[PDB]
């Protein structure tokens with residue numbers, strides 16, 4: 001028995017406490033790097049909350065057992081000056097993750113796929129408490145976003161997945177791949193950076209039109 005609720009500003013600390021327990025330690029890239037204390041990821045996670053489209057799964061006792069943090073993304077302006085997220089980061093491990101994200105964006109722009117769309121929903125952080133996994137909570141979090149999308153005329157939900165494991169979950173939920181890159185092929189300075197276990201494979205950007 002759990003509820004799916006909009007994350008409020010006063011929920012920030014509780015969301016961060018939950019993420020520190022699970023996501024910071026068990027996202028495949030975070031665990032590969034042994035991220036440790038990372039105020040940069042805390043900042044990254046809190047950023048989308050004021051967009052009012054992030055959701056928490058809450059058990060009967062009132063504890064957060066899952067979150068899907070989402071933000072609105074807008075088509076780059078005609079006069080856009082693109083920035084690398086990695087430039088303003090002092091945490092060497094998180095900088096590797098941000099550099100990977102920057103690289104993906106250099107190679108693939110979701111807005112090229114959907115020329116008529118100005119605003120797309122971006123699924124930024126998805127995490128479920130270990131003891132509540134395999135119960136469909138990820139799907140129920142995701143489905144709550146469809147409500148927001150309907151209410152606001154948003155057609156596309158975009159989710160960068162850090163492993164084939166999570167991409168498979170999104171596939172089950174009706175998303176399809178729009179871009180992929182193997183970790184073995186990511187060599188920004190000529191050498192492999194990420195070498196997690198073979199089943200992870202690489203990143204996949206997943207999309208659904210709702």
Ligand SMILES: CC(=O)SCCNC(=O)CCNC(=O)[C@H](O)C(C)(C)COP(=O)(O)OP(=O)(O)OC[C@H]1O[C@@H](n2cnc3c(N)ncnc32)[C@H](O)[C@@H]1OP(=O)(O)O
Nearest residue numbers: 026027124125126127128133134135136137138161162166
């Ligand atoms: C944008 C981003 O954040 S990408 C990164 C996504 N987040 C992570 O990788 C963090 C670590 N992983 C997690 O927190 C979770 O595994 C999630 C969020 C990916 C999935 O959440 P869940 O609510 O468990 O999803 P779901 O119920 O669909 O289970 C997914 C699969 O996990 C497997 N599974 C079954 N039981 C368990 C369990 N006890 N523990 C873990 N996995 C299980 C199954 O393969 C299951 O698929 P199936 O039910 O269709 O057969």
